[PDB]
Amino acid sequence: YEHVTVIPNTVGVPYKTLVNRPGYSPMVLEMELLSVTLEPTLSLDYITCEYKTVIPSPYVKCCGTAECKDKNLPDYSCKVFTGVYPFMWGGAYCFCDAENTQLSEAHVEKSESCKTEFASAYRAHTASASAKLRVLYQGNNITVTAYANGDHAVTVKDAKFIVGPMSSAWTPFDNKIVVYKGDVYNMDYPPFGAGRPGQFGDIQSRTPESKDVYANTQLVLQRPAAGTVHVPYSQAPSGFKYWLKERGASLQHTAPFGCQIATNPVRAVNCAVGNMPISIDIPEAAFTRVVDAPSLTDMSCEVPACTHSSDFGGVAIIKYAASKKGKCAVHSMTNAVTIREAEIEVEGNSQLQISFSTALASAEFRVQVCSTQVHCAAECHPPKDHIVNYP
Amino acid sequence: YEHVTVIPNTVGVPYKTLVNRPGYSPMVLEMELLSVTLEPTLSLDYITC
Amino acid sequence: PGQFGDIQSRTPESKDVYANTQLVLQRPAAGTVHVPYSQAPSGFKYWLK
Amino acid sequence: EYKTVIPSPYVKCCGTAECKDKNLPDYSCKVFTGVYPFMWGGAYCFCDA
Amino acid sequence: LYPDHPTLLSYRNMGEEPNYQEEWVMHKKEVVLTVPTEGLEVTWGNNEPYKYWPQ
Amino acid sequence: VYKATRPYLAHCPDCGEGHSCHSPVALERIRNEATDGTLKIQVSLQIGIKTDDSHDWTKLRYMDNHMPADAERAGLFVRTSAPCTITGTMGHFILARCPKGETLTVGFTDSRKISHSCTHPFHHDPPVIGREKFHSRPQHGKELPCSTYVQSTAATTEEIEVHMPPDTPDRTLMSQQSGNVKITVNGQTVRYKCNCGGSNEGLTTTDKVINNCKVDQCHAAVTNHKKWQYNSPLVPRNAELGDRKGKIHIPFPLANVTCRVPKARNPTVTYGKNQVIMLLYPDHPTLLSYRNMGEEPNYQEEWVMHKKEVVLTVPTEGLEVTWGNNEPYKYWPQ
Amino acid sequence: VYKATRPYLAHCPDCGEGHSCHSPVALERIRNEATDGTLKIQVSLQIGIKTDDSHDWTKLRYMDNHMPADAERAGLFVRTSAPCTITGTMGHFILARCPKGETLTVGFTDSRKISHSCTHPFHHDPPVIGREKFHSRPQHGKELPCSTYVQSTAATTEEIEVHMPPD
Structure with missing residues (x-):
């Protein structure tokens, strides 16, 4: 399956890309400029x-x-x-x-x-x-x-x-x-x-x-x-x-x-200018069918700590009900919020902890764990200050 | 985080102040006048x- | 630092003094016993002129 | 005019020295690792590292 | 900026138009710099470059 | 006090030709608080004291390897960009009058006729006492307040911190006994530490052997727990004892004295309606100041460098004008 | 090579007191390409060589009227505004670390205890290596690229032109 995305031509910034092959469990790939x-x-x-x-x-x-x-x-x-x-x-x-x-x-x-x-x-x-x-x-x-x-x-x-x-x-x-x-x-x-x-x-x-x-x-x-x-x-x-x-x-x-x-x-090396298209032809073996992947229900999300900054200043605790044990992809469905974790292991009626980054003081975002979405409500506080020192 | 409050200039009275840093659990500080x-x-x- | 009051003594006999001058200790030279450091000129000497 | 009190440095051979907070004006303390100092008659410490 | 000796300050935009600027800072000087969407890289003397991006 | 103290070897960044060494004339601190330009220099050696602790102004004692040795006072020198005039010497201290320079060097000639010196970067350009930049000190002149380091050998006010030294590292004490370490004391007290097991530590008065140990894994030094030394940042602290320290009085304290002196002059001018005109002819920078003698003085001042005509308004209350070191001139309208 | 070459007498504009002479220590060329501040000085005499061509670091050979003569290496001096630190000597070449100056003087004392010197106008104020103006060289610090004239007595890369003299 060919996954095509475009990232800015900026070195040292990890980018998260959601690979959604129809009939197959979502896959999160983290990409960071090696060298150009x-x-x-x-x-x-x-x-x-x-x-x-x-x-x-x-x-x-x-x-x-x-x-x-x-x-x-x-x-x-x-x-x-x-x-x-x-x-x-x-x-x-x-x-x-x-x-x-x-x-x-x-x-x-x-x-x-x-x-x-x-x-x-x-x-x-x-x-x-x-x-x-x-x-x-x-x-x-x-x-x-x-x-x-x-x-x-x-x-x-x-x-x-x-x-x-x-x-x-x-x-x-x-x-x-x-x-x-x-x-x-x-x-x-x-x-x-x-x-x-x-x-x-x-x-x-x-x-x-x-x-x-x-x-x-x-x-x-x-x-x-x-x-x-x-x-x-x-x-x-x-x-x-x-x-x-x-x-x-x-x-x-x-x-x-x-x-x-x-x-x-x-x-x-690593020119700071424009963007860079990326094409990845991911092999069939790397994918797991939706049926072969755990099914998540009764999802809830709470944000006990949040600071709106360039780095992962947000903490989110997501409670879930998984049908079976396995690995689930973690992805933010809102472009204004980014999650540090790409993949987490699920068990059953347990909870997961994720790290997130946002510039929003009032951050309302959806988190997709495997094939199920959960709404997260976050009140994020100011850091040190405006402008940020990370991409 | 800078917490700013105003207490009456009265000695021997403990005052409670709520520190609410956004995205951080609330903090209660008790202040009592030591000398002026x-x-x-x-x-x-x-x-x- | 480098201004009138960089060093302050309540009385001329006072043992403890206030100081705000930029004293930073540096790593000693290879195989050498010494205390290298970087440190604003006298505020009093500056005020005198 | 101010004056910088620097005692003999504590070179801890085969061990790690520890800095403590001292209530002195412009108090500066730093522990430097990987030192191998020499005196006239050779190395001051028994240990290489 | 509080230099103890002449210190070279340099900056550039991290986009298509870098617009490289430099100045030798002799004494106490406040510098106001514009941070574009692409980002700003600032080098203060022998220190590693600082990077800034808007929120 | 010299019976308890001793001269020592300490780090010097330049012992000649820009190379660092363990100097017997190492520079500790240069004091220049004296407005008269006198420098109070502190060195690792002791002047005016012999090895037997007796006082002799013609002698000097310095640390020669492990033991202190005697040297001549005549061989002692101080220099900046050119030689300095030494005004006083006692123990670790030297008083000197130096010409303008960027470095400070203190040296001497030992028993073996070998010269030893220590060079430190030091900006010396002493400020002017008064308003005249002169070379030689006059017998008569204007008495001005100045500070100096008194040439009195007596030690009563100023002080330095002292503590027990240090162990002299010597690798020749250790030898490879087949495949072990052999520490030979040779009638001395040796402090040893080995990166091996068993009795790898001790303050020994007798020969010691460390089996299954290599010569490179060991550290040996000749000690002398008997002897105070200046609390030098160029010498390591004694590891055994904590913050243990003593204090001793030092010669040549800073004191308020009198330095020769000078004088000044004044001039005159032309008049107008509520106006005074002065033709100033200064021979050097001269401070001109003026004020109204009423409720609003409006004090103004300027340093007059060369030929300048000054037009000043004289109000009803009057005008007071001070031209350099002259007594103030007073003007009133008719 | 010193069996074929010889020290010589050449023009010097200042042999002392501003007067020109046929100097046995005449200055040929002063090289200052080394960023570390080292000066490579070329003179008319030959250091470390005796009249019989044998190598002796304690000796120096200079042209004495018509025939070359031996002199002591200890008597050799280099100075600008103040004395220089001589770092290396071999044949016509001297390596020296000099303080700031406007002239360069190279001299020696002959067999008859007579001093000979040659003064040339030379502006010496070497640029700073790095970003700190220091006096003495440290054992430890930041390693920066710099050039120097190597103290090795060996002659393998650099060269000079030679020919038969004069009457």
């Missing part, structure tokens, strides 16, 4: 990290003129300084008084930290929805993990589950994303070769193994001090170090619908 | 004898 994963397909554009300025020993050409050549290196800077006369500990480095030149050379590369400390720029598109969940089935808790596309059929204890499709296709992920360790950010990052100095992407490496990198950091070589061998220069601070403090809160904290954000792989 | 002290601030002018 939205894993987008990622395409790595580049990685970014802290940059490092490679300056070799300057070429001091004594009695000659050095020549600068165009080298395909990031932020490559070359300058030949005329009229130099540098000194070392034991005197002048050059034989000539005049006509000595210093070739100052510099370029920009990935820091030693780039393997450990880095942010990855990904192109995120068409997410694959996957599902599982917790079902109180036959007095036992079963876990169902399925894609929430309304196609992926998962069978647990002969019960076939079809989860979704999701009412909302919202993601929390945009077309362009940035990943740093366990944090994901929606960022319209600059493309490769378009990074700005002192900003995210000042240094760009296509892959973390890549030998050649893009760099735009304002490296300018200066004329060395009189009689001094050194390479003076003027140069914007690390864009990655700047982004690390300017990034703000990650998607785990900012995403709507109570989304949980995880990495390795990048995914949206 | 009015101590004025004194400034000695002089003594006589």
